[PDB]
């Protein structure tokens, strides 16, 4: 049965062998040809593993590790895969010595938990009250983006957004609560952070729409204004002009009764979910609500339904019978700003007791490649700030802490006795692969540079003048997720067909 585990390590190590060369900005790209004929290329480790169409189940777990790495730290999706393959390669020689994989999996528990406390000793604890270090950390992390000069003004915008939605001591900070709304037109230098929310569509393109209202209430209504359409089979034949107006008055009477209950509820702004099945709101109802001075916004995507039901503090309305004023929201000012054919709608001043840390940021640009990369450019900036809020302090990247942990773990383990010394020192040898791939991808000598790093660790320290800083959560979530990934592999003793 060991042939299954021996094949799972080789199959997983072959995957990390190709990924370890793509680490860093100097990494080598990989050519991927899809079965449909589309040719794509990139250095992103999460993109390669997603489009690889992985079959073997053990290699499929590397995709979930890279997904959990980006969902927590947000950076190091390539480095976490390298460390996973390093522990499998180091444990390969341990199996030839007669070591059961359970001991190898249990030995990584004491090594991972101790490496966290050792990392906090060399780390320099920072604070969120100082905005000088926070802006410099987010600005230098954007050197991987197309715009180097425009990244200077984007750093303080991402820092100030997090400091307002977070207190001094925080742990769990959800970055999905901040929605980046991209719109064609404008420029990069013009950007505004809207408190309440920003939608993806306009309000009223016809005549009579106010498009702006002060002190408005906003709520989600899943209902839709349409003429009656029973599920049974009906036949409509109108042979006379009086018969056409008779059916029209019966339909307009039903269309008005829906608008009468809305006007009595003092609803300034309405939201209708976009449904391609039937019509959302009839054109006759838009003219009825035009005189009532009620803002109507249609074509709301299904993805934003769960976002509007939380940050706005309102509740979804399935039927008009259950529609009440207490289930709506509050907005201080609602206006529609049009910059170069924008007509974008912004909402500020929620002032609700159920309000939560939800702030929307509007991204503007001319070409499609502008608002695209900028959305991912600011996404990586919030991840770096999120790492400092959950765990305070930062470390110097570039493979420096990987060797420093290996040097301290190897010396402290020599005082152990028996089995404690032999097996638990193998974890330190697997940490040298991270600085090795950084020196190889940059053209530097593999062995020579690593020996130069071990020389300055005894005299000098982890450091700083090159403005290269790696957050601590990336290194914390690396060994943590790698210890559970390697454990879940060796614990599989066979794979059988079950259906």
């Amino acid at each position: 049965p060991q042939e299954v585990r021996k094949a799972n390590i080789i199959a997983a190590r072959s995957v990390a062998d190709a990924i370890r060369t793509s680490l860093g900005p100097k990494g080598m790209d990989k050519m991927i040809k899809t079965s449909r004929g589309e040719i794509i290329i990139s250095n992103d480790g999460h993109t390669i593993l997603k489009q690889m169409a992985i079959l073997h189940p053990v290699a499929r777990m590397l995709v979930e590790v890279s997904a959990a790495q980006d969902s927590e730290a947000g950076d190091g999706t390539t480095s976490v895969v390298i460390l996973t393959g390093a522990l499998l390669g180091a444990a390969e020689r341990l199996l030839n010595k007669g070591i059961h994989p359970t001991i190898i999996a249990d030995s990584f528990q004491s090594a991972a938990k101790r490496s966290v406390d050792i990392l906090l000793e060399m780390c320099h604890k920072v604070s969120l009250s100082d905005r000088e270090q926070l802006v410099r950390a987010a600005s230098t992390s954007l050197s991987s983006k197309i715009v180097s000069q425009y990244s200077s003004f984007l750093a303080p915008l991402a820092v100030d957004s997090v400091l307002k939605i977070s207190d001094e001591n925080s742990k769990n900070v959800d970055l999905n609560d901040i929605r980046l709304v991209k719109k064609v037109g404008g420029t990069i230098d013009d950007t505004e952070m809207i408190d309440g929310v920003v939608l993806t569509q306009t309000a009223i393109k016809s005549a009579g729409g106010p498009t702006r209202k002060e002190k408005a209430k906003i709520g989600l209504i899943q209902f839709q204004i349409s003429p009656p359409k029973p599920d049974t089979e009906n036949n409509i034949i109108v042979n006379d002009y009086r018969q056409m107006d008779k059916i029209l008055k019966e339909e307009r009477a039903y269309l008005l009764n829906i608008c009468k209950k809305i006007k009595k509820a003092k609803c300034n702004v309405l939201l209708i979910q976009k449904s391609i099945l039937r019509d959302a709101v009839n054109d006759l109802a838009l003219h009825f609500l035009s005189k009532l001075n009620i803002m109507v916004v249609k074509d709301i995507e299904r993805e934003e339904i769960e976002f509007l039901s939380k940050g706005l503090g309102c509740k979804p309305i399935a039927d008009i019978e259950l529609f009440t004023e207490d289930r709506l929201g509050s907005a201080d000012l609602v206006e529609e700003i049009d910059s170069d054919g924008s007509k974008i709608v912004r909402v500020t001043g929620i002032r609700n007791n159920n309000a939560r840390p939800t702030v929307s940021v509007v991204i503007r640009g001319a070409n499609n490649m502008i608002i695209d990369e900028t959305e991912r450019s600011l996404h990586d900036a919030l991840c770096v700030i999120r790492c400092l809020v959950k765990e305070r302090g930062l470390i110097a990247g570039g493979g420096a802490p990987e060797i420093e942990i290996s040097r301290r773990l190897s010396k402290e383990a020599r005082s152990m006795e028996g089995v404690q010394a032999f097996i638990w020192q193998e974890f330190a040898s697997a940490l040298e692969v991270i600085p090795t791939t950084l020196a190889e991808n940059a053209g530097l000598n593999s062995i020579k540079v690593v020996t130069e790093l071990r020389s300055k660790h005894e005299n000098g320290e982890l450091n700083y003048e090159e403005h290269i800083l790696q957050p601590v959560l990336v290194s914390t979530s690396a060994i943590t997720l790698a210890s559970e990934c390697v454990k879940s592999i060796l614990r599989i003793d066979d794979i059988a067909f079950s259906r």
Binding site: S415, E417, G418, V419, F422, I447, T451, R454
Partner: protein, 502 residues
């Protein structure tokens, strides 16, 4: 290129993997089939490597590795090969990382010079305290090498044979010990309980007739016993291709003038010649090998007399007496020659119930004699079993990070290669080599640095102090030398060209 560096490590590992399990007191034996059809079983690598014929040029360096060491030590035959093979295992990993083999070979030289200085501070002396204390630790020192052999039952009796045999062939001022001065001779039959230690030589002779006296007379207070060493037998001469009574008188008169009693010759004697020797008190010895005549003249300070007319007083070997002592019920009934004064050579008496048993006790006793040779020449002594590889590994590992260079990885792999020996002994002792390796390390750190070895022989703990297992310090230095020196010679060969046999 590539295939050269990879094949040399795999070929040397496969050959060295044969004697790995056979290294130790608990090591495993092997079956060796001679080309004549005889089956021999021994755990010594000297016979195994000599009997095994192989055309691999890489493994031939391992044959010459223990060939020169067999004369100097002889107990490091299988120990130097496994130690040198461990260096090749760590060197293979360095080649795949992009490190040139030149820096690997130069790194092993600095690792040896630094490790020798560590054991020089921790050595202790025995003979520097008391002379009676020297024989105390020396008597029980030979019992360690006899535990892996059938001798382990009688080891208490044979422990005194190795000590007394070396003292007779050495001087206090000279302190010179050589294995050529000790003769190892044994025959098939008998048992191992009747083997004593006698100083002299045995001619395996019944004295040709019972009427001759079993003891040599002093001949009116004469000096010793004068014996004749001749290349011609005593008898009427005969041609080798295809008057007798007067010939006997001419030969006997030459013996009485020289003052010789025992007549030793290479070939048998006539039955009629021994009849006149009874009344003249002239014992005769026949059927003596040609090589045995050389060893008699060395112990008895005699000479080789080619002809009857060349007899002289200064050419006669002088001994104390010559007697025939019966051993058990065996009908052999050899003869015993004694001295009772310091000689230039000694001979050990070894017996066994079977052929291979005789060679088993003969080689095991000779192995302990080579250890005594190093204990006299080198006063500094340490306990070598399991202590060296554990102590040498901890000293190099701590000083490796202070070098800050390419040799740092060569020193780390050097310490890990030393750990192969105690783990190999732990695998031979029936214990986990993982926990046994650090158990020897931790006891030398928290408590104090001492000599604590492998559990193969067994004790209440792993300590070698009370167990009285001692190894020569000069032997341990030469073992790590040739092992490291040959490892540089293995990487020294960058190409292998083998032609045909015409």
């Amino acid at each position: 290129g590539l295939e050269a560096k990879k094949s040399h490590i795999l070929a040397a590992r496969s050959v060295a993997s044969i004697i790995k399990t056979s290294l130790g007191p608990r090591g495993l034996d092997k079956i060796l089939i001679s080309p004549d059809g005889e089956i021999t079983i021994t755990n010594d690598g000297a016979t195994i490597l000599s009997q095994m014929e192989l055309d691999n040029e890489i493994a031939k360096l391992l044959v010459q590795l223990s060939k020169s060491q067999d004369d100097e030590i002889g107990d490091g035959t299988t120990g130097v090969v496994v130690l040198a093979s461990a260096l090749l295992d760590q060197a293979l990993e360095l080649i795949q990382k992009g490190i040139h083999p030149i820096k690997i070979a130069n790194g092993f030289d600095e690792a040896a010079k630094l490790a020798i200085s560590k054991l020089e501070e921790t050595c202790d002396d025995i003979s520097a305290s008391n002379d009676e204390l020297f024989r105390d630790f020396l008597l029980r020192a030979a019992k360690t090498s006899l535990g892996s052999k059938i001798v382990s039952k009688d080891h208490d009796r044979f422990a005194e044979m190795a000590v007394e045999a070396v003292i007779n062939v050495m001087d206090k001022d000279r302190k010179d010990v050589d294995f050529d001065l000790i003769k190892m001779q044994g025959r098939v039959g008998g048992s191992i309980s009747d083997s004593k230690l006698i100083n002299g030589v045995i001619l395996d002779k019944d004295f040709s007739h019972p009427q001759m006296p079993k003891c040599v007379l002093p001949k009116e207070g004469s000096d010793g016993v004068k014996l004749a060493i001749l290349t011609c037998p005593f008898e009427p001469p005969k041609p080798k291709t295809k008057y007798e009574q007067d010939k006997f008188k001419e030969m006997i008169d030459d013996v009485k003038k020289a003052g010789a009693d025992v007549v030793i010759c290479q070939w048998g004697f006539d039955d009629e010649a021994n009849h006149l020797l009874l009344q003249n008190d002239l014992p005769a010895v026949r059927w003596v090998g040609g090589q045995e005549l050389e060893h008699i003249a060395i112990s008895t300070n005699g000479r080789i007399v080619p002809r009857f007319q060349d007899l002289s007083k200064d050419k006669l070997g002088t001994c104390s007496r010559i007697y025939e002592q019966e051993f058990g019920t065996t009908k052999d009934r050899m003869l015993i020659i004694e001295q009772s004064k310091e000689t230039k050579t000694v001979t050990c008496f070894v017996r066994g119930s079977n052929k291979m048993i005789v060679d088993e006790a003969e080689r095991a006793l000779h192995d302990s004699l080579c250890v005594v040779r190093n204990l006299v020449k080198d006063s500094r002594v340490v306990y070598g079993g399991g202590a060296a590889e554990v102590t040498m590994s901890l000293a190099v590992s701590e000083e490796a990070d202070k070098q800050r260079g390419i040799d740092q990885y060569a020193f780390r792999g050097f310490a890990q290669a030393l750990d192969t020996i105690p783990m190999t002994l732990a695998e031979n002792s029936g214990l986990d080599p993982i926990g046994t390796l650090s158990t020897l390390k931790s006891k030398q750190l928290k408590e104090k640095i001492s000599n604590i070895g492998v559990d193969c022989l067994g004790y209440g703990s792993n300590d070698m102090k009370e167990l009285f297992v001692v190894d020569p310090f000069i032997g341990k230095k030469q073992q790590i030398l040739l092992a490291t020196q040959l490892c540089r010679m293995i990487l020294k060969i960058d190409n292998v060209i083998i032609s045909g046999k015409d």
